[PDB]
Swiss-Prot record:
GO molecular function, one term: ribonucleoside triphosphate phosphatase activity
Stated name of the protein: IMPACT family member YigZ
Organism: Escherichia coli (strain K12)
Listed Pfam families: DUF1949 (PF09186), UPF0029 (PF01205)
GO BP annotations, alphabetical order: regulation of translational initiation
Similarity comment text for this entry: Belongs to the IMPACT family.
Gene of this entry: yigZ
Amino acid sequence: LMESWLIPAAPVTVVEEIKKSRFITMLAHTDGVEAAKAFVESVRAEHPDARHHCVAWVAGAPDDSQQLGFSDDGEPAGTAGKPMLAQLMGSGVGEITAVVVRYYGGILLGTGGLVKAYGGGVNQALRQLTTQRKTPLTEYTLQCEYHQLTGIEALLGQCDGKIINSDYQAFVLLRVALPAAKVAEFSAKLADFSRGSLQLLAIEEE
């Protein structure tokens, strides 16, 4: 992927009136697909009386990792889904999802008309989105002894590190994650803790 990226620091909600109809775009931070799906429910729930609830998202890598998605929910194919996705791709903001909510007003508009209501809707919201940088943790592996477990968890946590997954065999096989800034400080701390016999390694297979 890439070093770091920007993500949403706060949700956004904007509304608009097109030919007596009611379009309400709602943005928000969503890391991963469950997250995206998570608030589609809330926006649907919240507006049962609205005919359509079109979606789109990126689970940001940002635009490097394609955890991209969309949906028309009854609006003419390629007219309520892709348009809003291309805005999210246009923004260059990872980990975000969008929902347009349609309340039919009695007057129907063309294929163009729908595209400017959906694509455009995500466009307006995007003008009010506040962001924040996000440097993802780096992941390494580390084989230690059981009598060093608690000790290592603690050192890890002091370096803003997180123990990803454990494997309890004859020895402990740990998959750790920590800021790439703090690796050298962690290694040093680690070596002093074990008299230089612990060996932290950088993942490779994937």
